[PDB]
Design a protein around this ligand. Structure first.
Ligand SMILES: CC(C)(COP(=O)(O)OP(=O)(O)OC[C@H]1O[C@@H](n2cnc3c(N)ncnc32)[C@H](O)[C@@H]1OP(=O)(O)O)[C@@H](O)C(=O)NCCC(=O)NCCS
Ligand SMILES: CC(C)(COP(=O)(O)OP(=O)(O)OC[C@H]1O[C@@H](n2cnc3c(N)ncnc32)[C@H](O)[C@@H]1OP(=O)(O)O)[C@@H](O)C(=O)NCCC(=O)NCCS
Ligand SMILES: CC(C)(COP(=O)(O)OP(=O)(O)OC[C@H]1O[C@@H](n2cnc3c(N)ncnc32)[C@H](O)[C@@H]1OP(=O)(O)O)[C@@H](O)C(=O)NCCC(=O)NCCS
Ligand SMILES: C[C@H]1O[C@H](OP(=O)(O)OP(=O)(O)OC[C@H]2O[C@@H](n3cnc4c(=O)[nH]c(N)nc43)[C@H](O)[C@@H]2O)[C@@H](O)[C@@H](O)[C@@H]1N
Ligand SMILES: C[C@H]1O[C@H](OP(=O)(O)OP(=O)(O)OC[C@H]2O[C@@H](n3cnc4c(=O)[nH]c(N)nc43)[C@H](O)[C@@H]2O)[C@@H](O)[C@@H](O)[C@@H]1N
Ligand SMILES: C[C@H]1O[C@H](OP(=O)(O)OP(=O)(O)OC[C@H]2O[C@@H](n3cnc4c(=O)[nH]c(N)nc43)[C@H](O)[C@@H]2O)[C@@H](O)[C@@H](O)[C@@H]1N
Ligand SMILES: [Cl-]
Ligand SMILES: [Cl-]
Ligand SMILES: [Cl-]
Ligand code: NA
Lengths: 210, 210, 210
């Protein structure tokens, strides 16, 4: 738990964390430490210092910036609130190759991976993930802790509910609203609104029941 | 109608205009004014000065560069001809993140959005839209006023007819020709030539009649 | 066969070569000559000097760097071995717009086109093609001489066998293994492992027999 001052604490030490670490370093930021539910190491050279019980120690030692690198959307949302309760500020991890329009509103704790484009007047909720190569056209609204998977695309005016997940290569046509907690499978093409809490797959995407 | 000299006039004041405005500003250009069929405001800080009846006034006051920011392909084509009749030059609106190969032939009034790649020896007709994240591989031929939607992709040697439209995430395999005025739905995967004036949807794309 | 010293020899003079030539020139490299099975010209200003029988002459004259610009995966693999037997080093042709993470392991003779992203801890075999706009998420393993077509995407932890081919816009969900010599059609969405030597198409991708 000997750290250098000033850097970013990461919650989570998986594959998603690797990619976030490399976005932060590409921006010139320093990653100080990881906390992981397996407290046993290092991720890309960043030390795993403990589990979430190490958060107060990290804060006391002067570290105050944090990113939640956990793919699971509800868990990420809960951990972001825990981190803020412990006095951390949630940074954004935006790869320098991402194109984020100057009229985009960004929340906090947002991941925006390499190759992303986000166009005019889009709003991006806290703790959203806009993954590698994803496209978000103008006037979209992305709720807190949703996840646009790699190579997915939203055409204009699409709203994505809190904690919704779009799989790799999913597509949404203009004006569509997708409910909270909804999953679009990989490659699904969404051509009408989706309610909350369903799973939709196919071209066109169709809701799959039990 | 008090303007600064030297900038670009925009026909259209919708969501597409927002994105074009931001491409032009990312290149260091100034947008002078919008003309919109609803002559009532501002779009991203650009004043709406009137409807298309204001074109001659704008030209007389020394403005001579124009972009047609209208998604509808036939309407865009008609408005580009009107603009040229009124003595405007049609500029291109190419986001600085777009990769346009040095052997690409570009027309005039072309939009090329953020994250696009256009490879060797492709030809891009006047008033085409190559939207956000779209890929155009080598040796493609894009007719005037066609529209490759966001995240769409053409493999090599594909020809797209005048005013054809490919929806978000559409794909075309090598060597395919798509007729004029044809629509490929979002996510459609085109594996054989399409004639003029049809609608094709699905993986693989199939023509949908009445 | 009068050449300038120091540049890259290209095997193949087709559409793929055009794109590779332009990646190399975008990096400031000089392309010295093409050898093509049709020994009859120039490709983008690069002289065709002969067929593969000209390799020893080229080496003797001091040229030692080579790229194999042949789309056919098995043929490319064979030609890369021939080139190395003749004393050439196989360079990589990585467009400057590609984002290649600093923990990616790259082989030799690899093409990485414009707009590609390759994330943390991915390994890319010799003579792989990562084509225009393709995305490779973290922890992927790409075998020698495979081809990820334009706008394709691998989510995390995907393994692609030697000489496998993914068509334009193909998608693979996390953790999937695709066998050697397997073809995924354009737009195919792979949701379970694929054995060697099959063809799979559709959303979801399904193996197509005779
Ligand atoms: C749709 C999904 C959520 C289903 O997971 P699951 O319910 O465990 O489903 P299974 O793998 O057991 O397959 C269920 C059935 O749906 C089909 N299926 C699975 N995923 C599909 C998809 N994306 N599109 C269409 N059909 C799909 C399967 O072929 C199977 O069909 P069957 O009835 O013929 O066997 C999942 O396959 C998916 O697409 N995940 C995306 C994950 C992702 O992209 N992650 C990126 C993280 S960065
Ligand atoms: C294909 C499209 C043009 C059809 O529009 P429409 O004819 O008004 O069709 P509807 O929304 O009434 O739906 C018609 C039927 O086709 C199906 N469908 C619609 N779009 C589909 C698509 N892209 N792929 C496959 N099926 C589709 C619907 O499920 C419906 O099926 P049903 O017979 O089971 O009800 C449209 O859905 C589309 O894909 N638009 C793309 C727009 C776009 O990407 N814009 C980006 C601008 S930058
Ligand atoms: C799948 C593929 C390999 C099949 O080639 P092929 O076996 O010669 O097939 P054909 O063109 O004769 O069509 C065979 C059948 O499969 C269907 N089909 C073809 N390609 C398909 C695809 N990608 N997805 C779903 N169905 C497809 C056809 O509609 C036809 O169906 P039918 O039985 O109703 O006629 C090919 O179409 C493909 O997708 N190629 C991708 C090439 C590419 O992306 N290259 C980029 C290089 S950089
Ligand atoms: C967006 C990505 O999300 C998922 O990636 P991921 O990195 O979140 O998932 P995994 O690789 O399983 O790693 C999650 C890591 O997160 C840790 N973890 C799991 N729960 C906790 C927790 O409560 N607190 C802390 N501090 N860490 C936790 C696990 O011990 C594990 O090391 C996967 O679904 C990927 O496919 C996807 N690309
Ligand atoms: C490429 C894009 O095309 C479409 O976007 P768009 O910006 O063209 O569409 P809208 O948002 O409806 O806006 C069109 C604007 O264009 C104006 N307009 C419509 N017709 C005219 C016209 O004849 N002359 C002028 N000067 N303006 C015209 C309308 O009054 C409206 O303000 C949509 O289909 C989008 O989903 C798509 N991304
Ligand atoms: C990745 C790309 O692969 C394929 O492109 P390609 O450039 O390899 O294919 P083609 O345009 O037919 O050109 C292949 C060139 O490669 C030459 N060639 C074919 N065989 C040989 C060879 O053994 N030695 C040499 N030196 N050259 C060979 C042919 O004479 C021809 O000029 C196509 O499938 C494209 O659609 C795809 N984008
Ligand atoms: Cl660091
Ligand atoms: Cl301006
Ligand atoms: Cl050169
Ligand atoms: Na892209």
């Amino acid at each position: 738990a000997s750290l250098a001052i000033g850097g970013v604490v990461i919650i989570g030490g998986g594959g998603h964390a690797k990619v976030v670490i490399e976005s932060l370093r590409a921006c010139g930021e320093t990653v100080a430490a990881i906390v992981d539910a397996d407290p046993t190491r290092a991720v890309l050279g960043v030390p795993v210092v403990g589990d979430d019980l190490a958060l107060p120690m990290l804060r006391e030692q002067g570290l105050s910036r944090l990113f939640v690198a956990i793919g699971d959307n509800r868990l990420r949302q809960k951990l972001g609130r825990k981190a803020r309760d412990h006095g951390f500020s949630l940074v954004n991890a935006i790869h320098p190759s991402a194109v984020v329009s100057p009229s985009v509103r960004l929340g906090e704790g947002v991941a925006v991976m390499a190759g992303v484009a986000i166009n005019a007047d889009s709003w991006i909720g806290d703790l959203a993930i806009i993954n590698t190569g994803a496209v978000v056209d103008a006037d979209c609204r992305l709720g807190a802790a949703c996840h646009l998977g790699p190579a997915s695309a939203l055409a204009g005016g699409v709203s994505v509910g809190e904690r919704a997940f779009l799989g790799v290569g999913a597509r949404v046509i203009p004006g569509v609203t997708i409910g909270a907690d909804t999953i679009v499978g990989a490659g699904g093409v969404v051509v009408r609104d989706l309610p909350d809490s369903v799973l939709a797959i196919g071209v066109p995407a169709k809701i799959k029941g039990d």
